[PDB]
Amino acid sequence: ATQGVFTLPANTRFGVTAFANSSGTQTVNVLVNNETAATFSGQSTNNAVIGTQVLNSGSSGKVQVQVSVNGRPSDLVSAQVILTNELNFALVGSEDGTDNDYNDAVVVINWPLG
């Protein structure tokens, strides 16, 4: 199944943060309405924040996270969870190798902000 795609409310600001747990350098692309809005690169085996920014969901509200390492797409896992019917997390894990810890790049989207 498709992973890493989330439909946010239209024209809503959200935060996106990325963490790295791999010897390989993680590049994370966040696409808004099928166009790229932010790009994080970094290497870390200790969960360092390689990127975090605020973006707007736009007309569409379509948000997609992709994870490449050295030009190889990583296998993604994802889900959205909503607490008290109002606080939202869109969650992405990814695997770049064979150990299946799916933490090599971890991406957290949260809204609303402010």
Added chain:
Amino acid sequence: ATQGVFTLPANTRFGVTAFANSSGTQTVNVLVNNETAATFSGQSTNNAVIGTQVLNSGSSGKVQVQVSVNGRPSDLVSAQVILTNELNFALVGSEDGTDNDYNDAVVVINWPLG
């Protein structure tokens, strides 16, 4: 119900990161097996990272997040989500006022690391 308390696998490194979205200065305390292990503080109304750090879950794996603003505890919502039986997120939202957006301090715990 108790919120913000999570049982992790024993002696496991985990990441904890807090973002803020409130006029009020947020204070996040992270206790591991009933000893405070990390303390974040900051103020932001557009999701700034006010703290991030790697901790070990220790013998019993008990992690608790608490959020206060000027000595008053905020009301917490929480849940844990597990993807592909391997990647864990423990999620905390908090409300320090009356608007109930529960994003005033947002805390994300993730594991495994490395």
Added chain:
Amino acid sequence: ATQGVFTLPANTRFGVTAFANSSGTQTVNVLVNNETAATFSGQSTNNAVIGTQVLNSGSSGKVQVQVSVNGRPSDLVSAQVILTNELNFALVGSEDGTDNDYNDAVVVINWPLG
């Protein structure tokens, strides 16, 4: 009588540790030379350590502990005890309510260290 004030030997490392046994969120201020040197906050009814720190007694050796819950100073009990003319504990109890168990925040200062 004043409680929670102790005169340490000047320029001496000491440990300070706070426990909580209250439904109320405890805020422990530790002042050295009448300036706040450390602040702990936390909530527990099972004696969690809500803060621990190593500090220096400074020029004056004067250390003071203050406890409030939601801005209300608690009533303090204190004493100092010295074992084999060497081992020092400065002890603080505090009550934030009416049951007078004086365990709501418990603060223990010990020296020498090392």
Added chain:
Amino acid sequence: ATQGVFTLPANTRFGVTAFANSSGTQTVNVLVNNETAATFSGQSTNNAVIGTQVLNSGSSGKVQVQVSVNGRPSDLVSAQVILTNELNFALVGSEDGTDNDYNDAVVVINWPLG
């Protein structure tokens, strides 16, 4: 004279917390009714908390603290202090070598909890 043994009220929750101040790894065993109830181990020269736990008095209320380093028992000092006839500290210092600072393992027992 015997040190590190205290008669608590029967069937009473109490906290026990240990600090290390030595190059040697300290092992702290807490016996309730002559039976091992908790074991802490660790090494620090900066008063790090090597263990905290809540235990029960039991029928006897007999609590005893023992400290060993590399197998060899440390010499203990102890006293109990009661403030406002209600808040109890049972206090232990230990010496594992020659300098007689008696802080090599420091254990604080306090009650009541809650």
